């Protein structure tokens, strides 16, 4: 913060009138509500002109049973990753200056235990017999404790021309069991990730986990909220800039099959990928952004 | 936020005088108090005119014993879902830009424990006999921890013309037991979701759980608090826009029957649906919203 | 909030506007109720309606009291199981109930699952040169449900555009590090021990009730409502006066203790008594004043 | 809050006006009470009534003290079981008690249910070719109750439109990692162990009382009230003067220790002594000043 | 707060002020005594205000004071820090307020009831078959609470005199205890500041290093107490004398050798260091001097 | 804070003062480093020196990658064990490094001691009228140490008045609910299991490395520095231009997996590769601007 | 705070224009970056002129293997205490008024548990034999819980002429073992504080704990952040004041030696002391501080 280096708070920041806007596009085939909120910041005391692009909207999860192959085997398509990406063409003079959020250093809680004890006893009965025991004990414990989200938010390695985030599936609770991930494997039941019952009396399709009891991101979807800061030199001859904005969904294939005794599930990674791209024009003189 | 990217706070946002209003309607048949609070925001430095629509009011729960087939079987209607939906006609130029709340990523706390120990003991009695014993142990522990609300609030997959929320029944604690949900099944007791006593001596209607010990959303109801942001192009020819708002309640059927040794309950999903729809007119020039 | 939708904070709210506020205080002696109405007239020209905020405060006494004493074997305690507040506009009124606070909040619960498994080896022996051996294994499944419970639940009753109300109801309560008990607790031997002081005692039934100092203060000293109701009124309306009835009421249960020649047993009758205190206020929207 | 009902925060409150404040200090020597009244006259023209905020502060000394000594087998300790502060308008007054802080809050408690079940297998053996085995199973169901309790409870007494008051009462207390004990704790051997230092030692009874340094600081050094009362006055009233009575009081219990020939036994008598300090203030609404 | 009674925040308070610093060092008593004062004269307030903040630092002076050979030694340590302000009785000015005050402690209590059943079947190669069916019940009570190394206590004030005492409560000793001034063990006595149970060194060596003990004991305690004094403007004598006293009470912790192990004994309130000083308050000039 | 020393907050900090800010961005492709400098010139007349605040941000890619594959029994994985950022002024410069953020924070640990003791009795018998009894006792002492560990530790390296720097180093990490492991973890059978996916599987060595999605995101996608350096300059200095070198660098370790005919065995070589990216900036104190 | 005594917040404080400055000096021999930030406050409504002296910079750890006596014995120098001291000459009329931080009162969490139980059991076998068992138990537990920092920050007993802080080594975790301090002793291992391995095959110098796994204060160093407030009477004749500032590092000597069966460590306290002093001139009239 500002006070940590003996300077009055808010002093070293960029603060000037700002020009803002909203641009909304809906991709029907890809089921993506894409909204770009932009702010043009022109601080004369700052050596660069700034454009802040906040990418919002919603990418639908589209957790859906897609095929029913008889009554033994059925297939479920589900979203394992949501991605948002911004890219400047290389010929551009404008640069990607900053981004939010970034990758945070995860933490874990470790705990070590040492217990030792002693115990004595006296025993007896009606035949006048009497016994005794003296025992001792030591025990060492190690406990690891940590928090994990259903989905991880990760900032991809940026350049000065391209940036992006991926919100990826980590693990999930299945009816107070698990947690399971894309790589969970059981010899009897295989991958129990979206498995409703271990054994029942129905067609395969019914045995998929009800999306209401799973992560709501899987079905109803994920709403990005990422910020990109682009800087522009005022003396450039060309005060126009193209920028590409991409929303993307990666879908995995979770299959259920019947092994004559119980259910077994199998998951194939990155089976499908829906990519929705749109190009925007940035006018640094007019301070407006269009598509 | 703005300070995370080296910019003065509150800079990049939309801020100008605002035109606000209230529209209240009460649907008696559906037992729904529907209130719409709206705000017209016209910032010249913003590329579009804004309308914020907050949908509030209260959808009654109407948790009730509706049928009485003697003293052996009875039926309880209960609300499993509350829904709010806003929809623009497709031919409209205005777009759904933003919404609150959105879907949150759940988290869970995991714990791993590894313990190992040793113990010794020496035994004896008055017959001069001496015994001895040396033992060792290892133990592995896994603990999963997470929070579940009685009802889940979910933002449905939006487009730029339609948006909505569903507040759905998740699971619920029943008199220090459970928690139970719509799919809980016990071979003896079936679904014990709203079952008061397992095997008492009363009529079936009496045996439903007192709403005072269940989620207050079930009976007294749920008060929506959702916001939609619509953007409008100032240069559009038609500066008038219709918008339809739907309130919905979906009720499940929980029936109790006596098996001569016990009570057993059965739950039918989405048996009834109360749907209350109203149309509003949005005048962007006059900056006023009416019904 | 506004910042969540890229708007300057406080932009979308009703404020730009002079407000006319007031206090009306009434004490109902027979019903033991202190009733305060704090009201605020907000007339924002940029708002499509006139606004009145009615904050219903004050305090409804608990009146937790031993009411009957049929000797030393039997006694009865009257206690408040519900506090209620209700506002109601007549149907012929043009003014509408627009909003209210508080509302019903969604409860949550903390769930915890444990799976533990272990092995142990062991060798035995003694002075007769004898040697024994032991290999054991174990597995264990644990499930924990965890949640917080208030002594009283605050509920917003199903509102209309003409009437609104809250009910603050008894939930459950700790009795001297035991329980918690509620209105429906039953023990075959002791019955409902909710306000039972001791299981065994040489003393009157009246003396065997739980000291109100050791119970929820809402039961005895009482509960102080803090509810807000927002009324909207159309400026074009012809009659710029609106009558409104405000009701405070208390529902009291009957908790009786009787001696079974060996011990104490408690019985609770629900909603035995109801104290209802109603009063009418006149809302003048032109004069921007509310009166009684 | 206001933002909860779509209104700019601080809009509906009384402030949108210059305030006249003051301090009145009195010390009751015989009753050991420092009594301070901080008052504020608020006259908001947009408010239908004049406001006086009376904040009652100061400190009521605990006066935890060994008062009598009957030999070395029996001794008595006076201790504060309740502090009380009360404000009362004469009924003939036109001014009304409008609001008060703090009020009674709804307590909560944390409940837990646990269900565990497990299995274990085991094989044992010997050098005599002997072979043994066992297969066991287990179920266990647990209930946990968890909650927080203060040493003293702060309670708002049932107010009227003329009188209000708070009481800070003794609840329970830890005694050297034991207990907690309260006024009704009883042990057949030791009686009430609340303020006894040792169970069995060789000293006078006076010696065996708990060092106040190891007890609640309120018991000895005392309690500092911080309560606010809000009085409303109609401007159109003929008599713009109002008398108001402010009362501080301390309730002391009698804790006796005696020797019973083998161990120590403690007994507590409730509400034996009561120190009450009353004073009258004159409220002049026109001059906007409060005097003594 | 004000918003709790439907009034705009900051309305009911007193809102130019004249402030000052007086510093004195008592070398003999090892006390750095600082008074920060503020004169507040609000026309809309019925009396003139003086806020007196008593700060500075009272050194702990945790030290081994005596060495009676190699079997016996004495440690002096601070069991109480005290601050006192006193107006003479004939003064018209009154003590109106003070901070901090005494807070009500809380404790966390939790009760558990567990009951279970267990079955088992046993057997061996001799075709023998055994069984057992068992049940269990258990009740647990848990008490939980937080206590500071020192308790900060506001002494019963009057309208002429006020004071605070910061007293030793209990303390952890090398992952053991906590111990207090009254802890007693029949073989070891009071193990409060004892380093080792049995080790061949001088008695002075066996005292706990101040670096592993509460820093208030050695380096000291910094008071931060405020007193609010009110004065009537119509008073004839617009001067007021006030005495401020800083105090340290030291206990005596003795270690002695019993030919097998160490034993500690603690005697309370053996020494008392009192540093008193008088200030002159001028309400007209709005200044406080010495 | 200032209020802690009886001064109005914000009084003693630096701030008629106008600040001259700017951004410099370069991307080193060979080293995969997005390097951004945000600078602020602060010239407070009431301050004895001109100030320049340099904020080093951007992102150093983790570049967690399988780099060699010697069949299906041996593979190598290059991973980032340290990220570093360094700023250096040449010796001949009169300008000085005055301050920096973050600095090294003091770690803490929670210690716990438990002492439990108990007694138990039991009576035994059977159908042969035999009667037995046993009475036992136990004592136990427990010590628990508890502390929080980040995946990477942020260290401020020992600064001078000419150069400053930070290193963000790998500490330890959880591997699929196992570990946590660090660069020196060793198992006689499995070696270092830090990034080992399975104990014994049937795949290529390359396929047996832990999925970067299940590892610290700093390892693959990378680390984003956020460091501040405060440089002071005398106004009276002759050369109001100052060169400064900024270095971003990544230290990569070598984690190899090999098959021992029964299972997998991991080996980690420290500081095998070092990627260094340096850039020269010109600081102009008169023109109040920074360039490269 | 002021609101605690019925006064508007910020009323009783000092506030006026302030004159601030920076003095940076680097002690190479002692490896100490020493920065002084000063603020002159002259409030006319305050009875004295104020100078706030903030001592910052960084004292390097210099955790280093210094000696090598073959391959069986070695020595490690480590910082056991960092110190900062400010001292006014006794003849000065200017006074040390205040200081931050001060000593905080530490706390601990104590909990006592009382548990008691009963159990029954019935036994039998195929020989028609019958057995019985009735048991009871009681147990009392005492648990202590508290937090201990790696280093303690302590304000030393100040006067009106001298003030200082010491940041001292408390204890430290050694590879999930310990924690150990300067007085830890094991008959077999001696002091295991900075010992890497109990018994291995390297030179002594190799067996010291990697500074990366120890407190970073030990190696990279400590950054002081201390404030001293000095008052000056405006009417004092001599409006100039010299002040000495001392930065100091106390290093302990941790030696490792091989006893032919395992490693044993020994630690000697306060072996070395690096002391770096600088004198500053305070001009109260010109409101400037120089070196």
Q: Could you please report the per-residue DSSP string of E85-100?
A: EE--TT---EEEEEES
Contact A108 F62 (CB under 8 A): no
CA angle F199, F200, F204 (to 5 degrees): 110
Q: Enumerate residues 6+ apart whose C-beta is below 8 A from B203.
A: B68, B71, B74
> Is B169 within 8 Å of B104 (Cβ atoms)?
no
Q: Testing the interface with B: which of A4, A11, A13 to mutate, by most B Cβ within 10 A?
A: A13
Contact G22 F126 (CB under 8 A): no
Torsion-angle region of residue E280: left (phi > 0), alpha (psi -120 to 50) or beta?
A: beta
User: How big is the A-C interface in CB pairs under 8 Å?
Assistant: 7
Q: Enumerate residues 6+ apart whose C-beta is below 8 A from C194.
A: C173, C175, C179, C181, C182, C183, C185, C210, C255, C266, C268
Calpha distance E158→C93 (Å, rounded): 60
F273/chain G closest Cα distance in angstroms? 18
E strand intervals along chain B:
18-27, 32-41, 49-59, 64-69, 73-87, 95-100, 107-125, 130-149, 151-155, 162-169, 172-174, 177-180, 226-232, 240-258, 263-283, 288-290
> Is F11 within 8 Å of G229 (Cβ atoms)?
no
Residue in E with minimal Cα distance to F114: E176
Q: Enumerate residues 6+ apart whose C-beta is below 8 A from A50.
A: A14, A40, A41, A42, A43, A97, A229, A230, A231, A232, B7
Tokens at residue C78, please? 């009257």
Residue in A with minimal Cα distance to C6: A37
CA angle A192, A197, A201 (to 5 degrees): 135
Q: Containing H/E element for A255? A: strand A240-258
Residues of B in contact with D111 (CB under 8 A): 176
Residue in C with minimal Cα distance to A21: C6
Helix, coil or strand: residue F86:
strand
Residues of F in contact with A126 (CB under 8 A): 130-132
Task: Using alpha carbons, list the distances in angstroms from residue E140 to C177, G112, G113.
Answer: 11, 11, 7
Contact G142 D177 (CB under 8 A): yes
Contact exists between G and D (3 or more beta carbon pairs < 8 Å): yes
Contact exists between D and E (3 or more beta carbon pairs < 8 Å): yes
Q: Testing the interface with B: which of D4, D6, D8 to mutate, by most B Cβ within 10 A?
A: D6
Contact F113 E36 (CB under 8 A): no
Contact exists between G and C (3 or more beta carbon pairs < 8 Å): no
Residues of B in contact with F177 (CB under 8 A): 110, 112, 142
Contact exists between B and G (3 or more beta carbon pairs < 8 Å): no
DSSP assignment letter at A6: T
Calpha distance B276→B291 (Å, rounded): 14
- What one-character-per-residue DSSP string does E24-45 give? EEETTTTEEEEEEEEEE--TTB
Residues of B in contact with D143 (CB under 8 A): 176
> Is D8 within 8 Å of C13 (Cβ atoms)?
yes
Domain residues for the domain of D207 are: 1-292
> Is G123 within 8 Å of G130 (Cβ atoms)?
yes
Experimental technique used to determine this entry: X-ray
Q: Enumerate residues 6+ apart whose C-beta is below 8 A from D12.
A: C19, C21, C40, C42, C53, D2, E6
Q: Enumerate residues 6+ apart whose C-beta is below 8 A from B118.
A: A137, A138, A139, B134, B135, B136, B137
Residues of E in contact with D101 (CB under 8 A): 4-5
Calpha distance C64→C81 (Å, rounded): 10
CA angle G58, G62, G66 (to 5 degrees): 165
Contact A14 B14 (CB under 8 A): no
Residues of E in contact with G158 (CB under 8 A): 32, 56-57
Contact G176 A6 (CB under 8 A): no
Residue in G with minimal Cα distance to D175: G112
Contact A144 F177 (CB under 8 A): yes
Helix, coil or strand: residue B212:
helix
**In three state form, how does the secondary structure of G133-194 look?**
EEEEEEEEEEEEEEEEECEEEEECCCCCCEEEEEEEECCEEECCEEEECCCCCECCCECCCC
> Is E264 within 8 Å of E255 (Cβ atoms)?
yes
> Is G20 within 8 Å of G277 (Cβ atoms)?
no
Residue in C with minimal Cα distance to A22: C6
Peptide bond into A101 cis (omega under 30): yes
Residues of E in contact with G138 (CB under 8 A): none
How many separate domains does chain E show? 1
Q: Enumerate residues 6+ apart whose C-beta is below 8 A from C13.
A: B20, D2, D3, D6, D7, D8
User: How big is the A-G interface in CB pairs under 8 Å?
Assistant: 7
Other Cβ atoms within 10 Å of D189 Cβ, number: 11
Q: Containing H/E element for B90? A: none
Residues of D in contact with G6 (CB under 8 A): 21, 38, 55
With b for 16 or more beta-carbon neighbours within 10 A and e for fewer, the C19-56 pattern comes to bbbbbbbbbbeebbbbbbbbbbbbbbebbbbbbbbbbb
F113/chain E closest Cα distance in angstroms? 7
> Is F37 within 8 Å of F28 (Cβ atoms)?
no
Residue in F with minimal Cα distance to G217: F104
| β-bridge mates for residue B127, sequence order | none
Q: Which CATH number is A125's domain given? A: 2.70.240.10
- Of C263, G118, G17, nearest to E136 by C-alpha is G118
Calpha distance D141→E135 (Å, rounded): 11
User: How big is the B-D interface in CB pairs under 8 Å?
Assistant: 7
CA angle B45, B48, B52 (to 5 degrees): 110
> Is A172 within 8 Å of A193 (Cβ atoms)?
yes
């Amino acid at each position: 913060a500002d006070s940590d280096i003996n300077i009055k708070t808010g002093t070293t920041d960029i603060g000037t009138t700002v020009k803002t806007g909203d641009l909304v596009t809906y991709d029907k085939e890809n089921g993506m509500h894409k909204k770009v909120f932009y702010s043009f910041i022109d601080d004369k005391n700052h050596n660069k002109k700034l454009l802040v692009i906040r990418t919002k909207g919603t990418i639908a999860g589209q957790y859906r049973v897609y095929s029913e192959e008889g009554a033994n085997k059925s297939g479920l398509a589900w979203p394992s990753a949501f991605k948002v990406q911004l890219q400047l063409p290389d010929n551009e003079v404008a640069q990607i200056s900053d981004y939010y959020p970034r990758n945070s250093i995860d933490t874990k809680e470790y705990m070590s235990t040492l217990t030792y004890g002693f115990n004595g006893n006296v025993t007896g009965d009606d035949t006048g017999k009497i016994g005794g025991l003296i025992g001792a004990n030591v025990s060492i414990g190690h406990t690891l404790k940590y928090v994990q989200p259903d989905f991880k938010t990760i900032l991809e390695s940026p350049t000065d021309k391209k940036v992006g985030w991926k919100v990826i599936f980590n693990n999930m609770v299945n009816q107070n069991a698990g947690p399971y991930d894309r790589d969970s494997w059981n010899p009897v039941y295989g991958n129990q990730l979206f498995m409703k019952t271990a054994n029942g009396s129905m067609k395969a399709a019914e045995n998929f986990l009800d999306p209401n009891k799973a992560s709501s991101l899987l079905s109803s979807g994920f709403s990005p909220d990422f910020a990109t800061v682009i800087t522009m030199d005022r003396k450039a001859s060309k005060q126009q800039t193209n920028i590409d904005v991409i929303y993307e969904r990666v879908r995995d294939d979770y299959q259920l099959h019947w092994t004559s005794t119980n259910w077994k599930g199998t998951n194939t990674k990155d089976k499908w990928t829906d990519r929705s791209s749109e190009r925007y024009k940035i006018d640094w003189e007019k301070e407006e952004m269009t598509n």
